[PDB]
Every structure is written in structure tokens, then in C-alpha cells.
């Protein structure tokens, strides 16, 4: 990493402010600095020399005192042996905005000889240099009276050039043949994009470019977007192939933390965070032994909103729900229970000893899938449901794994649908004396009322009535809900199957009547394209400006709606293969 924030390093993201540092400090870690975005501020110091042999550009995106991008003043002591003597800027070149203020530095030399109109590009920027060094020796004879120190290698200056009005403000000479490149913030040493001192936008491996290599590049061999192996990301005004070790990628740029609508993910070494499929995860506190609350009550329910993974446990006691009239507490509003529909994993256990009578199903725990059992509520139980009398079915339609512990479901005299459950399939490991199911609603009653597992479920069982409550189906499924068929030959969405789960076909497939429409999710599996064919792929519109490896690629649609590359010398695209169509 050659970049370091402002408020070892080559680029400075911010202001470089050096004040109060002692005389004997090793200032050599500033030896590699090349460009600084903000301003440069040096005051109240006591060292003798400033060394910037590699500094070339100070962009001055922020000016100090409202006028200056470089501000040096009062770097000396009154009654000790420490003061500034030289500014060793043997390779400094340009300042993009602001002026220069150097004043009241007792023994700073050579500043009167160097012409300031060259570095600063703002003509009417205030540049004042007074009451600075006193008995300064003359500049060296090799340097023609234009140097930074008495040395013979510390004298650049020069660079002053006039300009033709064609190039406007960015040029390297007065002739009409001498306009700088478009991507250059100031002056250049040549017309090329690799000769400019600073870039308007980004510097990649020496050149000034509008944007860094895109993550996706059109490949004329595959007729499709394909990953680019020579990608670079945005870190400030520098294109880098990998963000700093602590950083993460946002879209095409680096950031310390991904925005709340995306979550940091690792994809084979490269760390970038994609947008969340609806909403992003969040961990919240549990309930019980180890938490702050004996139960879930009206004083902790708001903090569980938008939570995805409960590091801990959940207790639903009567006192939290019914309130506590002895110690003034508001009773919990039952319609607020829907905040648990976002929960996916419970680290430890689940304890339910009371539930609202109007809610016969725990459907507020639909998206719950995992109960780890790393901690147990009571006796070795990772799941406890007792004395719930006005409850019909469970409703944990996506619950698939109880990692460890045991299960307690008793005294629920109106609970059905639980009788035919293959508990070996959910709880992992032994079923030798790990099930406590008694005193509920008898099998004899549930079967008579018609409350058994739906015949669409497999031999494992179900959490309740209907299709969307099966553990596993007997044939197909869609959206966690069992079905009899996917929409193969007809239906609202034409679909395909992959290991007994229906997925929607690619939207570019043409809906086929009486025969299969697509084989997989990609557009290379359609039997026939709905609009246009870009090789084997179905596309909405033909390529018209996509970025290729050799250049932008332009194609035209066929009468049979197949895109073909247009001739090598169109620019505005094409409506056909002929030259008349550009």
C-alpha cells in the first residue's frame, strides 16, 4: 500500500499537517511521497530540513485560510538551537488550486529565487513571501539562480510555458500542436496520458485514465459478459488491483465497511460485499440465563427488529406477555410478535411456555431454520413447548436442524400434526431417550378431525397442515412449499427443475407451448429465444457499445433476430451490416 489518509506512503488522502514535532525526528518515512490531495501545513516546528525528494504534486482539494494549499509559518524557536533552514523539494512540480503563504520563518532560504507563477495554476492566487530568511547565500552557479538549496542537484524550477487558446488551460507549449491529454489535471511533459504530472481522475501504473478496468468485459468469443483477469478497483484517485488488507470492496471501489444494504463476503481471496437478497443480517442479544431479561417482555421486543441471528436464546414467560402489575410493566402487544419472522438461527435454545390464544400457529417463526443448542434452557432441552393449551399447529415450516440438545413438547392438549414426525431427520445424532412428547392431543383425536400430515409430504412428516409445511415433498416444491408440478409446459412463470425444486426460467426464453421451455437458469438453456439470439444466448437487445478487449463492439440484429458483429469501422453503432448503417 502506497496510500495513507491525511487527517511507506506515496499518496496522501487528505491534508499533510506537520506541527510541533521535535528536531531529531526521523522524517525519512516521507521520502516516497508523490502526490497530496489536500493542503500542506507546517508550523511551530523545530527541525532544520524538510525532505521531499519525490514529491511532485499537491492537488489542494482543500485550501487553508481560504486561499492557500501550502502554508508554512513560524517554524523556529526563540532561545534554543532549533529552526528550519531548507525546503528540499527537488522534484516538486504543480499545485492545482490555491496560493502559497510563507511568512515569519527566521532562516528559510531560496524561496525568493523560485518563481511561483509556475507551480500554482491559479493566476490571481495570493502568493506572498516576506520576512523569512536573512543572510541566505546565493544560489549555486550550475542552477542559474533558481534552486532550493546550496547543493548542485537541488535546482529544478523551469516548466514555465505559454499556451495557444485552443488547449485552453492544459498544455505543455504555445504551439497549436501542444495540447495536453484530456485526463490531465494540470500541465504535462508531452501529449501522452503517461506524461502528465497529476491526473484529473485516476493514475493506473503510470497513466491517467477516466476509470479503472471494469470488473466485466464483453468477450466476443462467448458472446456474453465475462470476468476480467486484469481488474483494478477504486481507492481514492489511484487504481489498485487489491484494496488495503483491512478494506472491503463496494461495487468497484474500496471502503472500510460495506453499506448497510450489502454484507461483506469473501469470493476466493477477493473480499467484496453484494447486495443482500432482501435485507442484511444482524445479530442481537438473547434472553434467559446469560442475558439481561428473565423473559421477553414489552421492554425488550423493539430491539429484536430486523435481527437475523440470535446470539443466545428466547424465553416467552407469562409475566413478560401478561405484564407484571406488581412491578409496573406494560403488557406486550401481541401483533408486535411479527418481528420474529426475520429470525433464522438461534444459537442456543427456544423456550415457549405461554402464547397468545388468538394465535393458534407459531407462523411468526416461519423463516427460522437452525437451533444450535449450544446452551440449554432447562433440563437438557434445546426446545421447550409446554402448557400451551390453545395452540393447534407448530408452523416452523423452514426448521430443518436442531444441532444438539433434546426436545420437550408436552401438556399441549390441543396440538396436532406433530404425531408422524421423523425426529431423527431434524435432531442430529441419537434418538435414544431424547424425545419428551406426552399429554398432548391424542393421535386418536387428531386423525378423526382431519389434522394429520398432508399426503403431499414425504415419509418424514410435517409441521402442520397444507403444502408449505412439509419437511420433504413426495415430488416437487417451490419457495419452501410443496407442489405437484413445476410450470414446465404452461403456467404463470415458465420453470425448470433441479433436484426436485422449481426455479423460474431465464426471462429471455420464449414461452413454448406443449414442450419444455428451458433446461436451466442461464440463457444458454432456452429451446428458442423470445427476442434476439447473441450466439447461443438469448438477449433483450443486441450489443451496441459493449466494451471488449480490443475495443468497443457493435452488432446488428438479423431478420431471424441473431446479432452479428458489424464491420470494423462503425462508430455510432449500426442498424445493419452495411456501411450506410452506422
Amino acid at each position, epitope marked *: 500500500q502506497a496510500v495513507c489518509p491525511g487527517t511507506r506512503c506515496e499518496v496522501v488522502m487528505g491534508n499533510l499537517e506537520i506541527v510541533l514535532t521535535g528536531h531529531n525526528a526521523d522524517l525519512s518515512f516521507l521520502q516516497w511521497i508523490r502526490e497530496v490531495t489536500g493542503y500542506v501545513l507546517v508550523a511551530m516546528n523545530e527541525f532544520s530540513t524538510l525532505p521531499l525528494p519525490n514529491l511532485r504534486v499537491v492537488r489542494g482539494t482543500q485550501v487553508y485560510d481560504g486561499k492557500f494549499a501550502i502554508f508554512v509559518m513560524l517554524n523556529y524557536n526563540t532561545n534554543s538551537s532549533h529552526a528550519l533552514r531548507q525546503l528540499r523539494l527537488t522534484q516538486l512540480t504543480e499545485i492545482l488550486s490555491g496560493g502559497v503563504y510563507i511568512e515569519k520563518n527566521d532562516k528559510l532560504c531560496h524561496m525568493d529565487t523560485i518563481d511561483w507563477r509556475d507551480i500554482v495554476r491559479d493566476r490571481d492566487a495570493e502568493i506572498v513571501v516576506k520576512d523569512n530568511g536573512r543572510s541566505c547565500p546565493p544560489c549555486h552557479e550550475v542552477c542559474k539562480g533558481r534552486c532550493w538549496g546550496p547543493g548542485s542537484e537541488d535546482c529544478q524550477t523551469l516548466t514555465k510555458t505559454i499556451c495557444a487558446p485552443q488547449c485552453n488551460g492544459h498544455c505543455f507549449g504555445p504551439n497549436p500542436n501542444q495540447c495536453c491529454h484530456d485526463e490531465c489535471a494540470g500541465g504535462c511533459s508531452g501529449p501522452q496520458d503517461t506524461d502528465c504530472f497529476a491526473c484529473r481522475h485516476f493514475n493506473d501504473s503510470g497513466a491517467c485514465v477516466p476509470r479503472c478496468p471494469q470488473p466485466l468485459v464483453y468477450n466476443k468469443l462467448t458472446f456474453q459478459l465475462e470476468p476480467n483477469p486484469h481488474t483494478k478497483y477504486q481507492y481514492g484517485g489511484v487504481c489498485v488491483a487489491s484494496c488495503p488488507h483491512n478494506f472491503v470492496v463496494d461495487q468497484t471501489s474500496c471502503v472500510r465497511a460495506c453499506p448497510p444494504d450489502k454484507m461483506e463476503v469473501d469470493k476466493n481471496g477477493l473480499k467484496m460485499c453484494e447486495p443482500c437478497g432482501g435485507l442484511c443480517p444482524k445479530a442481537c442479544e438473547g434472553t434467559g440465563s446469560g442475558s439481561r431479561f428473565q423473559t421477553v417482555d414489552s421492554s425488550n421486543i423493539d430491539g429484536f427488529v430486523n435481527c437475523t441471528k440470535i446470539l443466545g436464546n428466547l424465553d416467552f414467560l407469562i409475566t413478560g406477555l401478561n405484564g407484571d402489575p406488581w412491578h409496573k410493566i406494560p403488557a406486550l402487544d401481541p401483533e408486535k410478535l411479527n418481528v420474529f419472522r426475520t429470525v433464522r438461527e438461534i444459537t442456543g435454545y427456544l423456550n415457549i411456555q405461554s402464547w397468545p390464544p388468538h394465535m393458534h400457529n407459531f407462523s411468526v417463526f416461519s423463516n427460522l431454520t437452525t437451533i444450535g443448542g449450544r446452551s440449554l434452557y432447562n433440563r437438557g432441552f434445546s426446545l421447550l413447548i*409446554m402448557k400451551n393449551l390453545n395452540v393447534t399447529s407448530l408452523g416452523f415450516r423452514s426448521l430443518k436442524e436442531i444441532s444438539a440438545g433434546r426436545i420437550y413438547i408436552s401438556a399441549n392438549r390441543q396440538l396436532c400434526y406433530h404425531h408422524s414426525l421423523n425426529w431423527t431427520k431434524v435432531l442430529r445424532g441419537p434418538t435414544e431417550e431424547r424425545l419428551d412428547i406426552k399429554h398432548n392431543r391424542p393421535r386418536r383425536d387428531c386423525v378423526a378431525e382431519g389434522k394429520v400430515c398432508d399426503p403431499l409430504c414425504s415419509s418424514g412428516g410435517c409441521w402442520g397442515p397444507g403444502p408449505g409445511q412439509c419437511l420433504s415433498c413426495r415430488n416437487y416444491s417451490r419457495g419452501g412449499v410443496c407442489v405437484t408440478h413445476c410450470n414446465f409446459l404452461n403456467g404463470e412463470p415458465r420453470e425448470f427443475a433441479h433436484e426436485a425444486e422449481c426455479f423460474s426460467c431465464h426471462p429471455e426464453c420464449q414461452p413454448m407451448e406443449g414442450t419444455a421451455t428451458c433446461n436451466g437458469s442461464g440463457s444458454d438453456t432456452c429451446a428458442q429465444c423470445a427476442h434476439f439470439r447473441d450466439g447461443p444466448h438469448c438477449v433483450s437487445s443486441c450489443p451496441h457499445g459493449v466494451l471488449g478487449a480490443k475495443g468497443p463492439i457493435y452488432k446488428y440484429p438479423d431478420v431471424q433476430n441473431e446479432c452479428r458483429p458489424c464491420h470494423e469501422n462503425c462508430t455510432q453503432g449500426c442498424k445493419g451490416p452495411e456501411l450506410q448503417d452506422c
Partner: antibody
Amino acid sequence: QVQLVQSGAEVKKPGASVKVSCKASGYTFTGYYMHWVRQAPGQGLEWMGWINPNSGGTNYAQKFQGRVTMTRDTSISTAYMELSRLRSDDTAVYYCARDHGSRHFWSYWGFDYWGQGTLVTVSS
Amino acid sequence: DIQMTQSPSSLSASVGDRVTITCRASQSISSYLNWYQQKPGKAPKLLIYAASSLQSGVPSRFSGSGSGTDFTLTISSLQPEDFATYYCQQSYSTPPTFGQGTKVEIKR
């Protein structure tokens, strides 16, 4: 005060049946479960079963399940245990103990009050 | 049946010593283990329930510790009323089980 009084010593022949009582006084009889534990002479302890003195629910141990019938009489606050199909290895001192929890699910099954012990000698 | 193992079988200690008996569970039993004292020929007395909780009436020298598999009943400064036989009881499984019993004896 809480006090559990059992019946006198019994002497049975191999094959008979014995029904030992346990008269409770000093607490709500239907509030706490009643445990039965026997101890062979010079041996360890052995748990046989508990009784819910309010509902009548039983929970016998697998070793004794089938030849032990424990009941209750709330009108006089007395618990009974009838061990039939006797053997010479059933000779022990049979204690009756009280569960220390009114709500049994949160009880730790610790016996805070015991009876005086009833000796039941079964020999030919 | 989660068979309990008490150690040691017998123990010879004098008045004023710190003694330590160990009740080991066959499987993990969380914290559901009790301790009892039985005078010879008399009904057992409840000392510590719930691994550590001291029963009301029992002196402060009686203390229990441990969880899961290895439990420990530690009493400091033996007293003349404390020379008897001690059993540990598990209440985790549906069939409870007692230990073989440690018998502390007066050193002489």
C-alpha cells in the same frame, strides 16, 4: 411441622404381597410428589417410583414396572405402595420421601423430608 | 440409567480436616445432582441439592461444586455430628440413581 409416618414392619413369604402406607402431615399433601426409595440391608439406595398426589399420575422404574401399584388417599393424606410378586431380594427398608418442589418441572427431585423406614423381610 | 460412581469408598479423617468426596456421572447430567447424609440406621438427610444449593438447616461447612460429569461435596473442619455415610443422587434422567456411598470414619 412436616412429618412422614410409615406403617409397621412386615414379614412376608416368597410370593405374597405387601402394601406399605405413608401418612403425611404438616404440609399440603397434593402439593408435592411422593417418592419411594428402598435400601437393602448394608447396600445402596434404589429408587422405585413417584406419585402425583393431586392427579394420581404414576411413574414406576423399569425394573419394578409391572408389579408395583402406588396409590393415594387425599381424604386422609396417605400414600400407599403395593409391591406384589415378592422375592428374597426384595427384603429392604422402604422409605417414603417428599419432593421439595410444588411445581414438579422445576424441581430438582431432592428429598427434604423422609419417613422413619419400614422393614419388610421376605424369606422362606 | 446414568450409574453414579462415588469415590472414595471409605475414608479415614479426623476432626477438623477438609474432606472431599467425588461423584462421577456416566454421561453429562448438567447440574441436576443432590447429596445426602445417612446416619447408620436412620433416615437420610438432604444436604446439598442442585449441585451447589445448600438445604436450609445444614451448616455452612457443607458445600457442593461441579457440573456436567464431575461433582464434588466438600466440607471443611469435620464435626462429630458429620461422621456418617454420604450418597449422591442424580435427577437428570427419568430413572434417578444413587451412588454406592462414601463412609467417613474417625481417624485414630
